[PDB]
Amino acid sequence: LPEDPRWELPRDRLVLGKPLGQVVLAEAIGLDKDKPNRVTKVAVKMLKSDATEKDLSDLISEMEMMKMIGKHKNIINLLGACTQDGPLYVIVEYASKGNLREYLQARRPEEQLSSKDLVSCAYQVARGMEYLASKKCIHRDLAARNVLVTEDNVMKIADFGLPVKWMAPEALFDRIYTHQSDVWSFGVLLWEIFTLGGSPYPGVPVEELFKLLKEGHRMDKPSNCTNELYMMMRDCWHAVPSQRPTFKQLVEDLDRIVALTSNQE
């Protein structure tokens, strides 16, 4: 494995901690060459014990793609790597509050989220995707499980450099993935937000779903969701991919809704 000094961190600067789920929590000493006695909590990905050449080359590809995508506050960013003195470690931002799906579920009547919190969560995820889309990145598996939440409740898209129930019909039938299918997935994600982590299409057997969808079946409005946000979901689920809003447009619409949503409802 060849070295890349723009990202290399010496292996002894990383104190490995607990498993996160392979991914471990760790402390990086002097990650910022400016502030060299500072420790920063980071997440580190490395290979499993019985892991194949394929697994290795995918880890590297994911890393290489992360290098190219550049930084955004609403995605999980690359921070460094140890590639030399032993096993490959890929170092990324740590999100202390875990994934959004579990974050939401734990806050069903851990503390209540306001309506404004919920819309602002959607906004942030949309911003992340707007960025990824602007860099011509197609996610393919956008879902609340693939958003992570920081200590400061910043939402960050996960696993963007690499379930049927989040796939646009044209992804579902023809394996055609586009920015537009990701928008479909975002509509499902919106629905997850406003059900506080609900299971999509409850009781619908997977094998029935594409038929149901081609037929025009769509999820009902969550019990506590405005008509406005439900129409956004529905728009994301336009049968015709061209007719769905862009992430650009969703960001603008959500920004306006956030601003009109009080901290008190």
Ligand X SMILES: COc1cc(OC)c(Cl)c(N2Cc3cnc(Nc4ccccc4)nc3N([C@H]3CCN(C(=O)/C=C/CN(C)C)C3)C2=O)c1Cl
List the interface residues with ligand X, window 63-102 (CB under 6 A): 76, 90, 92, 94-96, 98-99, 102
Length of the chain: 265
3 state SS of 247: helix
Which is catalytic among the residues 32, 55, 117, 141? 141
Distance CA 19, CA 89 (A): 14
Q: Alpha helices of the chain — where are they, by DSSP H? A: 53-69, 100-105, 115-134, 169-174, 179-194, 206-214, 227-236, 247-260
User: Binding residues for ligand X, how many (CB under 6 A)?
Assistant: 20
* 212 contacts 218 by C-beta, under 8 angstroms: no
DSSP per-residue string spanning 110-131 = -----HHHHHHHHHHHHHHHHH
If the CB atoms of residues 36 and 98 are measured against ligand X, the closer one turns out to be 98
CA distances from 67 to 7, 42, 112, 182, 240 (A): 9, 17, 37, 22, 34
Is 159 marked within a binding site?
A: yes
Reduce the DSSP state of residue 144 to 3 states and report it.
Answer: helix
| Beta carbon nearer to ligand X, 146 or 261 | 146
For ligand X, which residue of 26, 28, 31, 43 counts as binding (CB under 6 A)? Answer: 43
141 a catalytic residue: yes
In the set 45, 73, 218, 238, which binds ligand X (CB under 6 A)? 45
Q: Is 245 in the site for ligand X (CB under 6 A)?
A: no
Closest distance to ligand X from the beta carbon of 65 (Å): 9
Contact between 20 and ligand X per CB under 6 A? yes
- Can residue 170 be called a binding residue for ligand X (CB under 6 A)? no
Residue among 43 and 172 whose Cβ is closer to ligand X:
43
Closest distance to ligand X from the beta carbon of 103 (Å): 9
Nearer to ligand X, 130 or 253 (CB): 130
Q: What is the DSSP string of 172-225?
A: HHH----HHHHHHHHHHHHHHHHTTSPPSSTT--HHHHHHHHHTT--PPPPTT-
Binding flags for ligand X, 101-140, as an x/- string (CB under 6 A) = -x--------------------------------------
Q: Report the greatest alpha carbon distance in the chain.
A: 61
Cite the active site residues: 141
**Interacting residues toward ligand X by CB under 6 A:** 20-21, 23, 43, 45, 62, 76, 90, 92, 94-96, 98-99, 102, 148, 158-161
